[PDB]
Design an enzyme around this catalytic site. Sequence first.
Site, mmCIF file in Angstrom:
data_model
loop_
_atom_site.group_PDB
_atom_site.id
_atom_site.type_symbol
_atom_site.label_atom_id
_atom_site.label_comp_id
_atom_site.label_asym_id
_atom_site.label_seq_id
_atom_site.Cartn_x
_atom_site.Cartn_y
_atom_site.Cartn_z
ATOM 1 N N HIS D 150 32.043 36.916 30.431
ATOM 2 C CA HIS D 150 32.183 38.344 30.663
ATOM 3 C C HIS D 150 33.022 39.053 29.616
ATOM 4 O O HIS D 150 33.293 40.243 29.783
ATOM 5 C CB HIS D 150 32.807 38.619 32.042
ATOM 6 C CG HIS D 150 31.900 38.341 33.199
ATOM 7 N ND1 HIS D 150 30.711 39.007 33.391
ATOM 8 C CD2 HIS D 150 32.013 37.473 34.230
ATOM 9 C CE1 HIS D 150 30.126 38.552 34.483
ATOM 10 N NE2 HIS D 150 30.895 37.618 35.008
HETATM 11 ZN ZN LIG Z 1 30.518 35.135 38.216
#
Ligand SMILES: [Zn+2]
EC number: 3.5.1.98
Lengths: 130, 96, 96, 393, 50
Positions: D150
């Site tokens: 992320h």
């Molecule tokens: Zn995740």
Amino acid sequence: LTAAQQQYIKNLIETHITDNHPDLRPKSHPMDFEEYTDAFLRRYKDHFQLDVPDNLTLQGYLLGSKLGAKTYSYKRNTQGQHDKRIHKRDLANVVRRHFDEHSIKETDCIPQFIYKVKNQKKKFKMEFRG
Amino acid sequence: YDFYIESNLRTIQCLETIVNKIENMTENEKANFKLPPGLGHTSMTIYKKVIRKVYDKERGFEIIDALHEHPAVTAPVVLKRLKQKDEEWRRAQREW
Amino acid sequence: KDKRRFNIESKVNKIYQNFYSERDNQYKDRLTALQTDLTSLHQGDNGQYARQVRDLEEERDLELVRLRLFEEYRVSRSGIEFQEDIEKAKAEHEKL
Amino acid sequence: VYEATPFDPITVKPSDKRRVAYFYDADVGNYAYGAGHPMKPHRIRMAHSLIMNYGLYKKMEIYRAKPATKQEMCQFHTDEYIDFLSRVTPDNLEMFKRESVKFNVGDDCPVFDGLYEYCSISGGGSMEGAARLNRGKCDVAVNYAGGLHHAKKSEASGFCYLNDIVLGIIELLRYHPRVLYIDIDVHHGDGVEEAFYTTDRVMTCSFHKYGEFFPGTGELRDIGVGAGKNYAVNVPLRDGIDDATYRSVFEPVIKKIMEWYQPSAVVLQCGGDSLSGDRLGCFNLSMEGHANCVNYVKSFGIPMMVVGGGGYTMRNVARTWCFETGLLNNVVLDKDLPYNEYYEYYGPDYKLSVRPSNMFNVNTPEYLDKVMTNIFANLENTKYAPSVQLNHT
Amino acid sequence: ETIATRTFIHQDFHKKVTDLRARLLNRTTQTWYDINKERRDMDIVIPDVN
Ligand SMILES: [Zn+2]
Ligand SMILES: [K+]
Ligand SMILES: [K+]
């Protein structure tokens, strides 16, 4: 809270808590040759053909204890052999002495420096002792 | 619980090797011993956070200092406190 | 003081000139150095491949020293726990 | 273009064997985000324990990889970001109040002691796995400390601070034309997709949950811009999806990608917030359902690089990672856990099982048919021109 | 656990040693070809124009 321990703790945090600028990383003296990567030391000793053994790195120097005395490294570096390495301080002192006694006078130290810097990218050039 | 205890258990390992080596050396080697940051192993962060967990978040600084400058005086003394809190904490853990 | 500038340029040009003149016997030296490095790496006696294998060995053995000291501590821990639990069982059974 | 089927017993095929290189570093478990944070590196350590005590270490080779250097981090991140990571500590945060505001630091991604070292371990493991895969040594390369998918090129996002998968794929691309990336987290793999969006050499394929969720991206109509158009596959799904459903969606997408894109190096994120019982995800996957993905991606036969990811209930990530690692070695394990130093955490019956719940599946044969048809349509502009001799990938 | 980590220690040593040797071989044979090219480049009497 007694007007001594206060500034004591204050100095402690003021000296250990900073913004870790690379401009404050503690740098060693140039004359203390023990702070020299132990590959600089070996290359110096190998270039000026000094007469020393190699050094014990740091893992081989803490490897020395009654329990550590049964490892292959101890029994290959402490019996009767010629490759018996030593403590970095000894090799560094030999190197430091050969540094402060062998001496140089310019008129050939500078032009060699310039030829070296201007040819860094070159593979085929003048090797100033080899 | 697991975090604090298993983080104590690695500083124990390091200081243990260092004390085993200090017990097999002379007196001039005791006054001529120094350890680099990292104490001779891979990590450079875990032992300092252990030391200020066990001792103080502010006075663990002096202990880490004297641990880098005087490993022969300072770190058979620290190793006997980590081993104390190891047993205290494991007692509490297997209780709960 | 341009004489100093003339000296330095003359010397550096001298180095370039010497290298270009000897450029043909300063090229078999390179190739013998290289061929001997090759044939000595192929055997194991190379002054640089025999100097770092020994550090990879000096660092493998501190590993095993740490492993053994740590197993000693682990066994001591297990023994302390076993002893405390046996004492508690017997003593409090009798109190009961 | 989807018919639902039952979920078949996961089973290792004997015609192919691998040379697994497993990467672990006994330091990693020793870092902690803070008091109540859902991210706990300790679980990686826990998985190691089972690997040792099941006797599974005896068919693979376990290595510590050297930490990654600052200038290997700046191959994808900026200098200001990485310099911030290197200089910030829980003690001097007050002197970085601008940068913390500016690099997305402070609540969802705090600064702990050992942040830079943890990042070094993750990145190092990923890049060394990739390099060892390039040198023709190993076939599979496992690194469970990496998969922080992320993270942004200039920003910390979603428990992640450094995108080690980007570095890994950059190293894999030095010698390979076309690299596939599969992401079976419950969140969208948005850092990797944002990083490789306008290219055709990395194909990203996410299977995520789209809704009032995190991060908020990854629709069915987000398929790449520029020369990277049709080189970004999203499969949005709804709550409750279980093993049979997931397997029937997951297999044909991957098989069509393999037939068309013909990639010849797969990276596989094996996040564990997509298991039943997780504390942030919302799927209803078993352990066999979550491991059949790995088994299928392995049944093809091209260099795989398996990495970690999410998983916020430690017990379940530990068990499914150990089971997957046993499956990569052609070994179906046994259900009774051996005694190990974490013989808690495994209540109430101490077995190698992840149990699903009875919550309801909000995904039905028409939504999935529509999604998979749109995807099969998007996924035919991604072949190789007829005169281009390959190396049998 | 101690038996397993014993095996791990020896496997990691073997890895690092074989990397050492392959890397030194590659470095020397790199330097050789660079020496060759920089030698022949001193043999040109009339360069190219562009
Ligand atoms: Zn995740
Ligand atoms: K995903
Ligand atoms: K792409």
